[PDB]
Design a binder for this molecule. Structure first.
Ligand SMILES: Nc1ncnc2c1ncn2[C@@H]1O[C@H](CSCC[C@H](N)C(=O)O)[C@@H](O)[C@H]1O
Ligand SMILES: Nc1ncnc2c1ncn2[C@@H]1O[C@H](CSCC[C@H](N)C(=O)O)[C@@H](O)[C@H]1O
Ligand SMILES: [Zn+2]
Ligand SMILES: [Zn+2]
Ligand SMILES: [Zn+2]
Ligand SMILES: [Zn+2]
Lengths: 825, 831
DNA sequence: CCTTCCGTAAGT
DNA sequence: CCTTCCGTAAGT
DNA sequence: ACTTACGGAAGG
DNA sequence: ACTTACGGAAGG
């Protein structure tokens, strides 16, 4: 009703008079308390905030500053969240005291000094980021002196964010005829100087080298619908694993001069121009791709061509050095940091040759401790391998119930205690006070584990699972109980993409709630492994968590370009869209890793090879193979074996064309003489297909009675036919079974590597691009980014399962580097 | 931790010693307070309940009885609900005091004594106002029962509600007759609150028994002929074998029997009331005799035939009790007896199964001897008045005011209601006028004030919620008309409230509109509920699923949804509604069968004379008498020779030729059209359709001809100039057919044994709902046939041209459905 | 004008 | 054993 | 996979 | 409508 100020006013500025206490409707109010307000526009029935300022405007009305809270229902947690728990957000607003409904009490529940040893009114514990779905510890910033009257952490976070984001000129040179020339500018926290190199989108500029793109021949020959009676199912014109729509990598340029204009006497820093020396990627020269197969992905070519771009198109800064001015070798300089490129020659666009670059392209002169990591569901160790490639963790403990995976883990990690028992039983032993198991292996205790990582079985969450038991018993909750008992400093959970949408995202919301209740900072996101150095589509949901005293890491920024079809990392929970902190959407610094860079160096083998150790018949033929085979001399190639297929499947694979996109739909309807007097029968079409109609020859396109709208007729099932009967049987409602008995293409990439490559499975494009066989164990590990020195164990099926279940070491390394960034500062 | 009893225990029972107060962690707890409990299995993070008993078991454990609350998120409201608001439920259980987390504070928000005239710290505190029924989604006022000292130690409203429900639910033997050799004979039994006596009639499922008349089902139709794909190049799209508006899968109505003897068994010395047997005399519906359906077209839907056949059924299969009387024992006429109450059947003859004739029934079939005030109702979006007409057929309301911005609908409403003030202004403007204290508008029409409106009813525009609307992407629900209609309900605060819309109203915007309207009703203190009703189940031959939202004042009783009266096709009886993974259904108990047979197109259109396409004679005479019970209900018993509004739209010569080439067989539509050349009006010539493109989805025809008409059939982009004009087969139908279910029903015919699709505002054979062709005549349905499908009496008047009258008919609530709802509203006016 | 033309998605 | 067979629905 | 269904805008 | 993809059970 009536508003009356209490006490002496606080420091008054030009138009407002800050106060400390106030009385509304016989109540008392002080800065730091909380206030409820009734909404009129949002679907939410109530809003809660905290008072930070109590100024009185010169208009005569009484105002106050409210830093809003966020109910758990408004977060990604939703209805599962504790109704007494609130979260901090970067939302704040000025409002009159006439909208104050009541005064509520909100307390701060800080983690105990012995928080890591635990685990046997309204309140908030963490800050919530709505855009990235990030639960983080509240800032430690405090009101000092002058800001005590309007201290708003939301205003501070907002001012620092937009000031870091906006461009700013630091060092000016000279002003000539209305144009100011600069030498040092900055934006997004990045300092840009003259002589540095800069990432640009591919549409920033072109090259004087004319790239040719003539007509493609259209279906040069018509197809015989009697010989190939299932080709009409390829009308989609879509090729799985094709990099035709793959975007070009970042354009790189050399800043020579920076200039801009003026606005109202001062420099217009909002519109800064950059003039650059164009760099030539080996795929941009006259060689195009065909010459850039063996070259490094970070080797460029200097040019004296020039182009003018805007500073607003700058995506990032990269370090480009001349080859001979280096103080160390090329490999140590390339593997020493990110965004590092090098060049030894220069490219002339008109002469179409390679020279030595001028002297103005030359540069001036022209121990972190590893974390004790426990790896639950370690498998063969791909996740812990990537964590070791980041040099942030020694995996001391390992849990793996499957024996061959545990053996393969022991072969690659000699200093790891590998437990083969069940995770529930193993945790029950350490809860009972036991020191060692029956085998004498010491059990980790509280304080031993500094990081907990694992990838629970995704067979229940997989999109391919047909027969889709309760949460409190599912393995992901046992894996959470490990995090509750040991309370590590960092926590990582890996699963398939569909993990964030299983049962309307209930599993995700419950795992996040359990992390929030323990006091852990946490976040989630989806990452495509193909963006981090592998030639395979592998979207995986990652759940990160950090201790209250630590810093919550960010998600790794993509390093390689990839097909946009497989880069849909968005996640929708309860009508609210959430994305990771990734800022690179269109392009990236490095080109896409292809099948050619993944399998070209491996020798040619027949279907059913069993020699587990054969020699290399050549040297590495790409940067990817050079990274996996190492610089040391290693002539033995291990695990290059393919499954022995039946003569029927073998003949089917021999009749699959080598052209990209080919699959079972290109198979001919013929009879083939096999071993001895065995005969592969022909497929007979004796039923009408009401959906597909007749063919051009008038022949039918149905194989069963269900193609006529009737029920399935047993005894209509054909056996030992070249064209598999089951594929036209259920093809109409299964996307014509695209990819089955399909081939990879050299310029393309793998589909998601599974535990058993079979051409008649759901993901059935496992045929070699040239050879008449399925992919080998080594080719599967190559698609996963495993080093060739990595060992496996078991038979061919056991090793395939180890490769398929594993997290690609490139992706695990990308995550581990962002974890390393938190150990610093 | 430590739990200690406080004081002396009250009313101690055999194994339990009830207490009133207890101490947990040095705290105070007393019966009537509330308690927080941590869950272990549910996704919910917390549970809240109220302590009713605090006994100590003789086993040594300390127990207490918890009547659970229901968070607003756990209800149909979901995230929109007030986080401080709880609801009462019929959930209760015994539990140990070791699970008590903390003691919370819950207050009771009772409606104020001047509630009808409204509408113009300590952490967090909870409140409740209404009782929630999870199965039917019903918000009702809490019961007023109070504890007597004897029950004050374990007073649990959930246990009372469950005990009364299960006692009413269980079968019970009342009056037994004689016990003979282990079998007990009964004379009076009861269940579900229904009293059953010897000599009464009983509803049974169709599988209860058969008849001595053998109904045979000989051959299914053979393969008539291969289809000429050159003459009929669009027949291959009818492989679905589905006939729209077909009553082939329609279930049979209730079997009716006459209770003669009741017997059962024994269990543990007592009578086994759980297994009661009924032997009955079978009643013969006219469609069950040797006449079959074809002879039962003109007979009443409630006329039966007596028989001396016998059959033994179970008492657990009893669906309801019905009143069957012999024709001559009546004290009043047959029409006055049928229109006097529900479930009333009559019979004048008896049927002998072997002689196949009709006699006068024997003497053992004969019976013994052988001012409600109307509610002042405001009708927002009244249209032509179907909703208020159905409310008048229930005799529960005089519609005193009406709001209708469209002029022809308002005029037709005035024609059918002479004592209604019909406002043509906008509802927002009119409510803003009554908020400023103004009495009348510029026209001198008196505006209703607080206390004038006793019932508020309306159906806001459904074109935004209709499934046929393509460009449905305006937000700001708080300003959409449904909130304006809620603002009327907030201002006047009537005793009853009804909102009608399409079924998709409960799934629009991920069910946010429904949750927000229900939340707004809950905030006003209103009891409320929602449901989906099929109009075809209440006396019309039309599929018309409509979402209904009911609401009642706190001092009143929330009505139930009308129980289905007629059987209907199960394809269109999917009344379930799923919101936020939770399934909700109405209180309807009749799912399989019903008391009356289905109303068909024959019962709806057989008496209307034959007219040509484009008829304009607004008044033509009847060429005969009513030919069915339905027509006798709409035409009345009085002599009325003039048939009004039997006019058809004038189709273009092209469309007219298309309709002439539509076969009369059920399920036929545009896909049966021949690809021929037809001479039209004057020198116009209808060209043939040319297939010059490959259809990658449908392939080639049997003649090798193509099945594509545009480049998009090959996967390419649409090519203009490939569009053909003045063709008999419409080009746009094979153009976009693959992704529109082959445009089934377009240029389709109704069948006599079938029913209408949803009656729309403009019948066009090339629209989405395009089966508007007459079963025999080559024309679209008339205005009278549309009003017939909507259940409108033939005496009801319209206004405007043929399109204005069509739009009045389509937008209207079917009077049978509105009457079915109004009867359930009438049951609350009593007691 | 009006005759044609045609992104429901949500259920079931 | 291992070769065939096939209710994702959820997204975009 | 199919079936529902108080339609509206584009095209001459 | 159109593509996704740490598959599992029915069968020979
Ligand atoms: N109950 C259980 N206890 C221990 N290990 C289990 C288990 N259930 C399944 N596993 C094993 O956990 C493994 C997960 S595969 C994941 C491996 C790891 N993420 C990597 O990148 O290499 C499976 O191979 C399975 O054999
Ligand atoms: N803003 C508005 N104010 C008043 N009436 C409106 C309106 N918007 C639409 N209308 C009218 O509301 C009518 C709904 S038709 C519904 C009629 C009624 N349910 C019955 O059974 O007969 C439409 O004809 C339309 O003209
Ligand atoms: Zn602020
Ligand atoms: Zn079949
Ligand atoms: Zn109870
Ligand atoms: Zn087209």
């Amino acid at each position: 009703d009536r508003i009356s100020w209490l006490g002496q006013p606080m420091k008054i500025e030009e138009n407002r008079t800050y106060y400390q206490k106030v009385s509304i409707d016989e109540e008392m109010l002080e800065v730091g308390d909380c206030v409820s307000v009734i909404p009129d526009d949002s679907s939410k029935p109530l809003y809660l905030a905290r008072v930070t300022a109590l100024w009185e405007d010169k208009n005569g009305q009484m105002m106050f500053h409210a830093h809003w809270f966020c109910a758990g229902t408004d977060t990604v947690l939703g209805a599962t969240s504790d109704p007494l728990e609130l979260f901090l957000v970067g939302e704040c607003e000025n409002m009159q005291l006439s909208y104050i409904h009541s005064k509520v009490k909100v307390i701060y529940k800080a983690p105990s000094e012995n928080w890591a040893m635990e685990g046997g009114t309204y309140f908030f514990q963490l800050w919530y980021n709505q855009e990235y779905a990030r639960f983080e510890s509240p800032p430690k910033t405090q009101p000092t002196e002058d800001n005590k009257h309007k201290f708003c952490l939301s205003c501070i976070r907002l001012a620092e964010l937009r000031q870091k984001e906006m461009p700013k000129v630091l060092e000016q040179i000279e002003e000539v005829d209305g144009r100011v020339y600069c030498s040092s500018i900055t934006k997004n926290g990045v300092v840009y100087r003259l002589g540095d190199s800069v990432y640009l989108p591919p549409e920033a500029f072109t090259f004087n080298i004319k790239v040719a793109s003539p007509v493609k021949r259209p279906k040069k020959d018509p197809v015989n619908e009697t010989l190939y009676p299932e080709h009409y199912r390829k009308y989609s014109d879509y090729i799985k694993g094709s990099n035709l729509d793959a975007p070009e990598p970042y354009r790189i340029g050399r800043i020579k001069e920076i200039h801009c204009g003026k606005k109202k006497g001062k420099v217009n820093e909002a519109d800064i121009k950059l003039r650059l020396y164009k760099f030539y990627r080996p795929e941009n020269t006259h060689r195009s791709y065909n010459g850039s197969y063996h070259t490094d992905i970070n080797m460029l070519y200097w040019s004296d061509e020039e182009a003018v771009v805007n500073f607003s198109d700058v995506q990032g800064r990269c370090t480009v050095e001349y080859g001979e001015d280096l103080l160390e070798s090329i490999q140590d300089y390339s593997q020493g940091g990110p965004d590092r490129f090098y060049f030894l020659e220069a490219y002339n666009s008109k002469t179409k040759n390679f020279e030595d670059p001028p002297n103005h392209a030359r540069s001036p002169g022209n121990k972190l401790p590893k974390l004790r990591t426990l790896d639950v569901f370690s498998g063969c160790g791909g996740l812990s391998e990537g964590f070791h490639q980041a040099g942030i963790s020694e995996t001391l403990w390992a849990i793996e119930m499957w024996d061959p995976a545990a053996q393969a883990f022991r072969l690659n990690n000699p200093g790891t205690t590998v437990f083969t028992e069940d995770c529930n039983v193993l945790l029950k032993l350490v809860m009972a006070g036991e020191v060692t198991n029956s085998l004498g292996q010491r059990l980790p205790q509280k304080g031993d584990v500094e990081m907990l990582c694992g990838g629970p079985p995704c067979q229940g969450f997989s999109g391919m699972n047909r027969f889709n038991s309760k949460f409190k018993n599912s393995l992901v909750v046992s894996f959470l109980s490990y995090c509750d008992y040991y309370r590590p400093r960092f926590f990582l959970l890996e699963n398939v993409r569909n993990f964030v949408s299983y049962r309307r995202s209930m599993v995700l919301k419950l795992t996040l709630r359990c992390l929030v209740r323990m006091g852990y900072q946490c976040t989630f996101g989806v990452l495509q492994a193909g963006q981090y150095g592998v030639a395979q589509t592998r979207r995986r949901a990652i759940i990160l968590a950090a201790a209250p005293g630590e810093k919550l890491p960010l998600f790794p920024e993509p390093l390689h370009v990839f097909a946009p079809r497989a880069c849909q990392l968005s996640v929708v929970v309860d009508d609210k869209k959430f994305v990771s902190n990734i800022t690179r959407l269109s392009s990236g610094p490095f080109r896409t890793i292809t099948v050619r860079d993944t399998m070209s160096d491996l020798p040619e083998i027949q279907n059913g090879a069993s020699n587990s150790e054969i020699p290399y018949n050549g040297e590495p033929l790409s940067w990817f193979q050079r990274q996996l085979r190492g610089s040391h001399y290693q002539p033995i190639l291990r695990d290059h074996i393919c499954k022995d297929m039946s003569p029927l499947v073998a003949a089917r694979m021999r009749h699959i064309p080598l052209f990209p996109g080919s699959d079972w739909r290109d198979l001919p309807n013929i009879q083939v003489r096999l071993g001895d007097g065995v005969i592969a029968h022909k497929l007979q079409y004796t039923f009408h297909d009401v959906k597909n109609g007749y063919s051009s020859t008038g022949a039918l396109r149905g194989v069963c009675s269900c193609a006529e709208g009737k029920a399935c007729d047993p005894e209509s099932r054909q056996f030992s036919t070249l064209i598999p009967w089951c594929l036209p049987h259920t093809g109409n409602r299964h996307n014509h079974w695209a990819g089955l008995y399909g081939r990879l293409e050299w310029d393309g990439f793998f589909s998601t590597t599974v535990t058993n490559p079979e051409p008649m499975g759901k993901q059935g494009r496992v045929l070699h691009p040239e050879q008449h066989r399925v992919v080998s164990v080594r080719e599967c590990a190559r698609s996963q980014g495993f080093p060739d020195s990595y060992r496996f164990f078991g038979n061919i099926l056991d090793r395939h399962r180890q490769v398929g279940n594993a997290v690609p070491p490139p992706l695990a390394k990308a995550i581990g580097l962002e974890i390393k960034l938190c150990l610093l500062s």
